[PDB]
């Protein structure tokens, strides 16, 4: 079954109607990354995929979840779906580790012992198993970022979403945290990443879905579509380029 299933989905604030008329199809395994200008709606897009936004038409269901069913709830999407935001936080009162097994030792009650041992399969994974015990507030953004990621695997989601999870970073902590997301990628995690790094989304991503003013005008794999855009404001988005 379709990891992620939206048909015309429509999202209005107010008199301006953010999305208006979206269909994304991905199934599991996928990377997709979304890329435009600013007040594409590409942010709107992610929250409406796990809850955090609500939407006006339209239907999405995630893995089978009618995110407008009645049963559906916050901790029933938060069980398929993680997400990483552009601007991590972290609780520096508690361990990395407990910052970690929080979530999922009060959703899924896993006892603790087996909350942190799955908790520090993952800071090995992100490679920080040596700030373990460390608190969040010592960790540079580069590091608290592949924490925040550590913690949103923690659920053990089947989507992972990200929305610019490098671009706050300075430069230099920008690649650490992209490593990471590449290995996610080659793990078979589905993906949906809204970012700036072309880079990235060249060699990891599979198909790459670009959004301008509520519409999605182009998708294609990264390669067709950046170096040989058939659509006509996609030629022009590329161009200004970077």
């Known amino acids: 079954l379709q990891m ?35 007040g594409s709606g590409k942010s709107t897009f992610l929250r409406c995929l796990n809850l955090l936004e609500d939407f006006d038409e339209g239907e999405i269901i995630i893995d089978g979840i009618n995110l407008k069913a009645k049963d559906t709830n916050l901790n029933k999407v938060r069980e398929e ?4 935001f552009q601007r991590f ?25 087996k ?79 809204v970012t700036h790094e072309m880079g990235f989304a060249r060699e990891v991503g599979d198909r790459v879905l670009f959004m301008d003013g509520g519409y999605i005008i182009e998708e294609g794999k990264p390669e067709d579509l950046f170096d040989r855009p058939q659509h006509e404001r996609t030629k022009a988005f590329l161009s200004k380029v970077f």
């Open 81 to 84: 779906v993680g997400m990483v």
């Open 4 to 38: 992620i299933d939206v048909h015309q989905l429509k999202k209005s604030f107010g008199s301006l109607e953010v999305l208006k008329g979206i269909n994304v199809h991905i199934r599991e395994g996928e990377v997709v990354v979304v890329i435009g200008p600013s």
């Open 89 to 113: 936080n972290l609780f520096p009162h508690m361990t990395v580790l407990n910052n970690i097994t929080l979530a999922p030792m009060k959703v899924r009650k896993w006892p603790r012992e």
């Open 115 to 193: 909350a942190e041992a799955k908790a520090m399969e993952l800071l090995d994974k992100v490679g920080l198993k040596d700030k373990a015990h460390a608190y969040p507030d010592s960790l540079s953004g580069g590091q608290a970022q592949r924490v925040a990621i550590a913690r949103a695997l923690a659920m053990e989601p089947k989507i992972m979403l990200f929305d610019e999870p490098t671009s706050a970073l300075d430069p230099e902590m920008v690649g650490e945290v992209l490593s990471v997301m590449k290995q996610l990628a080659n793990e078979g995690m589905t993906m949906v990443v």
